[PDB]
Design a protein around this ligand. Structure first.
Ligand code: HEW
Ligand code: CL
Ligand code: CL
Ligand code: CL
Length: 163
């Protein structure tokens, strides 16, 4: 565990993270995909061996000894708001199980279902709150990666508001 488990946010490529493992915003078929998934494929291509896993689940594959936790958030184009909400919460619970099982002291994590799976909606708050629900009982240092300056501000504010 981390000595004083924390949340942090950084605005940069999750492929350049400084943590002991990474969560991929994966697709169910283990394809190279777009956005976070394509950056992860470029950095850790070996981790996409048998990475396919259903919506609402996480599957870890090692790239050398570095764990890549493939977390499949729902595509809100396909799911109802209600079913999508349930699957998004579930993907993060499976990430918390994997992070715990791996025994890491830190994890780099994107906001699931906020990009091309958002169904063209702003899901920062919805995705972040599910992240907190899952990860709050873990003792890993959590570092959330984003690319948008205003998202960075909002995420930082949401973290600081609970400290
Ligand atoms: N490569 C990336 C892309 C996004 Br979106 C967030 C973090 N890292
Ligand atoms: Cl960068
Ligand atoms: Cl996404
Ligand atoms: Cl972002």
């Amino acid at each position: 565990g981390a000595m004083a488990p924390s949340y942090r946010v950084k605005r940069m490529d999750i492929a350049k993270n400084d943590e002991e493992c990474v969560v991929n915003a994966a697709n169910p078929r283990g394809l190279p995909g777009d956005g976070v998934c394509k950056a992860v494929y470029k950095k850790w291509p070996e981790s996409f061996k048998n990475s396919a896993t259903p919506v609402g689940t996480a599957k870890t594959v090692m790239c050398g000894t570095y764990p890549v936790i493939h977390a499949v958030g729902p595509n809100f184009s396909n799911y109802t708001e209600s079913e999508g909400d349930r699957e998004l919460a579930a993907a993060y619970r499976e990430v918390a199980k994997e992070v715990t099982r791996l025994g890491v002291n830190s994890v780099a994590i994107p906001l699931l279902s906020t990009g091309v799976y958002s169904g063209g909606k702003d899901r920062l708050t919805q995705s972040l709150n599910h992240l907190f629900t899952a990860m709050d009982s873990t003792d890993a240092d959590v570092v959330i990666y984003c690319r948008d300056k205003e998202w960075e501000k909002k995420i930082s504010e949401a973290i600081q508001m609970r400290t």
